[model samples]
Structure formats: C-alpha cells, structure tokens
Target: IVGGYTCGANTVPYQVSLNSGYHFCGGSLINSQWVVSAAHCYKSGIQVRLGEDNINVVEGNEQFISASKSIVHPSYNSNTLNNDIMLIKLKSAASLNSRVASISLPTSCASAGTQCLISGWGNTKSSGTSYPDVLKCLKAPILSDSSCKSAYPGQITSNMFCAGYLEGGKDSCQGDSGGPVVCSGKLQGIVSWGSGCAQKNKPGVYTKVCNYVSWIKQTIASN
Candidate 1:
C-alpha cells in the first residue's frame, strides 16, 4: 500500500497473511470456515495467519490455519484477470475472538465515487518491491466504469473496478493482491491488478466482491 499508514493492533482483524513459509498475499476471513482471496494467489500448502498487524513479529491475537481447499472462480481469466477471485476453506473453523473475526459482507454493490479503506502488507513503494512489516492502510475512491475502461483501454471488465488517485501517489501494489477493499464497512472489492503502484492515470484494479456474493454463499453452503 503505497503512501499508506501503518494499521494499529487489531485495527484490521479480518486482514490475514496468506503464506507458504512467508507472506505472499493478503486474504479476508469471511466466516469461521471460509476466506476470500485472489484466484491468482492460489497454491498448494497455503497457510493463513489471522489478526496479523505485523508480519515479522508474533502477536498473541493470532490464529494459524491451513487451507483445506482453494476454489477459484469457474471462469477466471488469467490473461485479463477478470473474475479474479477465490474461496479458501480452512482446515478448521476459527474460534472467533476480539482479534479474529469475519469481515462484514456488503448488502449491495458499492458504487463508484465511494471512498473506501484498503489495507495490506503489499509494497509501500511505487516502484520495485518492498513490503511493510506491519499492515498498511490507504484511502481511495472507487472510479466509474468509463474512467476505469479509459485507463486500461479495453482491458477493464464489469467484474473489475479501480480505486486510487488518477494523479498518482497512493495505490495498492504487489503482495497486496487478494486483500480486502472495504467500503461502507462492507467487503467491496478484492485486490486484483494494475500497471504499477501509484502510477498516474493507472489506478489499481480490484475484483468486484458484490458480484460474487451469490457464488460465495452457494459454495460455502455446499462445501
């Protein structure tokens, strides 16, 4: 999260580090047994660490769990990254606590022009890779479809939306993908992709979480 501030302890209880020895991506706890992340973050042997304010430091309010299953969206397009979302089933349900709980789901789609909060351990630099040990938070407004399409030039899709400044400076970057984009205190988007961190005219793209509520609930029901 470029030009973002460090989150306070337990400030983002739902944010988690998706790991396989080290943090690679962020994820959000949806329920006791389910987590939502980017489809592109999927890999075998994934482990989830919840209530993680700092990555390098161990905190008491933490729950370590394994990924029992990772279900990617049926029509996820790797090339264009459309529908770039994934559901992760935990090996065991989380014992909800003050520092470990589910993120609130959106009752409706978060519209453009809405200012939102985004957090992650992704690179804080606009160029090259460098992640903060602690979670970082940024404020950005969702862009209209035309604005998004205009920036990406035929690369944008309905399943995708963007949140960042058009003038550059603040944005979500690498290692932030799969993290939560909260709007109106609801799960609004999932970090997906972008040209570069905090680049002018190229804000970060995200998977529209509201578009997958049905699929998310249905998958959780059957599994």
Candidate 2:
C-alpha cells in the first residue's frame, strides 16, 4: 500500500500473500481452505502464504501452501475490469491460529463514508519499485457512487466501489491488487484497480465483495 504504515504482527491474521517469484498480489483468508483475491491477479501456480507479516523474514508463524484450484468470477471482464473477484482453494486446510485465521464476509454492503482498512505488501511508491518488506495499511472512507462514477467515468460498475481520499495521498498500489479491504472487521472489498496510485480524484477501486457472497458460497460448497 502506498502512503501507508507498517502493521504489527498478527494484527491482520486473515491477510495472505499471493506469491509467484515474490509477492505479486495479496488476498484474504476467507476460510481454512479458501482464499479471496482479484481476478486480475490470477495466474498458474499461485502459492499462498498465510500469517505473513515481513516478506523478507521467515517468522516461523507463516504457513506456505499451493493453491489447488482458482476460480475467477465467470463474469469478470478484463476490458472493463468488472467483477474482478477470485477464489482459490488451498491444497490443504490451513491450521487456524492467532496468527492465521479466516475473516467473515460482510453481511451487507458498506455505505459511503464508512471508514475502512486496506492491507497489503504491494509497492509503497506511486512510481517505480519500492515494495515494502512488512505489510502496509491505510485507512480511507468509502466513496459515494456518484463520486466514484465521476472519478472513473464509464469504468465504475455495480460490481465495483471506491474507497479512499478523492484528494489523494493514500491508496492500494500495483502489487496490492487482490488484497483485503476490511470494514467493520468484515471483508467488504478486494483491491482491484485505479487510475494511478494515490492520485487526486482517482481513489482506489475495489471489487464490491457483498455482490459475490452467494457466488463464493456456491463455488466453495459444491466444488
């Protein structure tokens, strides 16, 4: 996350790092066997590391596992970046503990102006590469639909929402895509896309997670 602060250990138990060579994306542990991320981050051979804080350190609290399967939202469109949610089933169930646990999905949609927390290990700079060694976090209130639409013009869809300062300063960045956007202790959003990192009138856009709860449940229950 850009313009954010480093999080303390175990503060974000549900956070997971989606690793290819290094941490390329972030996700949230929604269950012992499933993780929630963004469709845009999907690729073959996703290795999930739970209970991770510092990317460079082996704290011994981390649990590294490979994804057995990944199911990106069927309706996700790369052109419009709509429905940018994805679920990855773990090769084995994660052992829940204080350092690694699942977070509940939001029971309802979050209202505009509601404050939220976004956590990730993505780029810390608006330009160039400066990925943080420790997890970074930022707080921003959810923006109204009209305001969000104004920011992105034709890009804002019913499946997406904005949550950050319209004036800019803080935001989820490039590698942060697919990270958790938590509101009231529930998983409400997934870092999806934005015009630029911490740019004015271009707040961080997220996948409206409430809209996909049923789909997530169905995908996990039957598969």
Candidate 3:
C-alpha cells in the first residue's frame, strides 16, 4: 500500500512474501497449506515467506515454504486481467502461531464505499525505486462500480473492483500484486493492477475474491 507506514509484525499474520530470491509480490494464507494470490504473479521458482515483517533479515518465527503446485484460474485473461486469481499449494502445512495464521474469506462482495485495509512492501511513489523492507498498510474505501467505470471505461469487470482515494494519494503500487485487501476483517480483494501508482481518480484495481468463492473451493477440493 502506497502512502502508508510500517505495520506491527503480527497485525496481518496471513500476509506472506511471495519471493524468488527477492520480494516480488504479496499473498495471503487461506489455509494451513493453501495460499491465494494473483495469477499474473505465478511463475516458476516462486516461494513463500510467512510470519515475516522485514525482508532484509529473517525472523525467528518465519516459515520459508516452497510451492508444490500453482494453479491459475483457467479463465484468467492476462491481457484484460480478468479472473486474475490463483491458488498455490504449499509443500507442507504451515505451523500456526502468533505470527503465522490464515485469514477468513468472504462469501459476498464488498459494497461500495466500504472502508478496507491494504498492506504491502511496494514502492511508495509512482516512479520511485526505493521499496520498503517492512510491511506497510493504509485504509482505502471501495469506490462504486460506476465511479470506477468512469475512470477506467470499458476496463472494469464484474470479477474486478476498485479501491483507493479519488484524491490520489493512497493506493497499491508496483510489486504489491497479489496482496490482501481486508474488509470487515475478511479477505475481500487482491492487488491486481492500476494505471500508475496512486494517480487521480485512477484507484487501484483488484480481483473480486467473493466472485470466485465457489471456484476456489472447488479447486482446493479437487487438487
């Protein structure tokens, strides 16, 4: 989340660093052995670091887990970024603790104007290079579909949603993809994409997790 500050180490335990020798994306633990993230983030050599706050050093509570399988939604459209969700099976189940846990998923969509929290280690500025080492979080409100559509004509879809400031200061930026957007304490959205980090009226776009609850359940069951 851009224009945010460092968060407490255990504040968002479900948060995970999706890494490939470096922190490239963010994810959330949906179960002891399953992780939910963005399909665009899937790639070979992906690994997850749980119970972590800082990326420069490993914490005692950190669990470095490998990915046994990565399943991108079958209908994911890389071009349009539709159905931009993915599930990752961990090589082994994560041991739950104060610094490690899973987040609850929502059975319904977040309504317009709902205030939610988004956290990540993405770059703070649109063209900046310095990325934070610790997790940073900020509050952003969900914009109505009409408002979002006005800003991104013909791009927004039912499977996608928008959340951020219309004034353009706070948003999810580069490297924040697959991060969690928690609304009413439930996993609601996934950091997917945006025009440019924190631009005016161009709130960050996210994958609507509620729209895929059934698919997520089916995939996990059959996997």
Per-candidate clashes come to 0, 0, 0
**4-57, model 3: which lDDT tens digit per residue?**
877888688999999998999999999999999999999989889998888888
Which residue pairs come into collision in candidate 2? Answer: none
Which regions in candidate 3 have their CA more than 4 angstroms from the true location? none
User: Cα lDDT of all candidates, in order?
Assistant: 0.92, 0.92, 0.91
User: Once model 2 is optimally superposed onto the true structure by TM-score, how far is the C-alpha of residue 214 displaced, in angstroms?
Assistant: 0.4
1-223, model 2: which lDDT tens digit per residue?
8888988887999999998878889999999999999999999989999989888899889999999999989998998899999999999999999999999998999999899999998888887778888889998899999999999888899999999998888999988999999999999999999987998999999999999999999999997
TM-score attained by model 3: 0.98
What's the TM-score of each model vs. the native? Answer: 0.98, 0.98, 0.98
On the 0 to 100 scale, the lDDT of residue 13 in model 1 is 84
How well does candidate 3 score on lDDT at residue 85?
A: 96
Candidate 2 structure, TM-score to reference = 0.98
